[PDB]
């Protein structure tokens, strides 16, 4: 399923790993691990293959945790977009999908746009929207 992919951070050499509805962390990349597999289910939403829930946040705020919510096309809190040069974040807001700061294991929204807010399709040099729509 070429549609399903792993979400990879080059600097850490690690991949996103869905642990539960309230916990999305990282792990050593394993393309066999269903918990590491995601897929776009619309132009803006990314679904966990293992949980059949969509990546989202409680609010568009710095250091909000990114975890998993029932997929809802009308929710503005589970809409993502590619920014430039593999930068990835909330649609319409300068808050980025981020990992690596403060010993925090969960993916966070962060204002910073450095190497830890940059994400590729694992096994490619392409941004996450290379597996999406539009």
UniProtKB/Swiss-Prot annotation:
Disulfide bridges in this chain: 15-29, 54-71, 82-129
Domain Ricin B-type lectin: 2-122
Swiss-Prot/TrEMBL induction comment: Down-regulated by interferon gamma.
Localization in the cell: Endosome membrane; Cell membrane
Tissue expression per record: Detected in macrophages.
Sites carrying sugar chains: 84
Main function: Mediates the endocytosis of glycoproteins by macrophages. Binds both sulfated and non-sulfated polysaccharide chains. Acts as phagocytic receptor for bacteria, fungi and other pathogens.
Protein name from the UniProt record: Macrophage mannose receptor 1
Organism: Mus musculus (Mouse)
Gene giving rise to this polypeptide: Mrc1
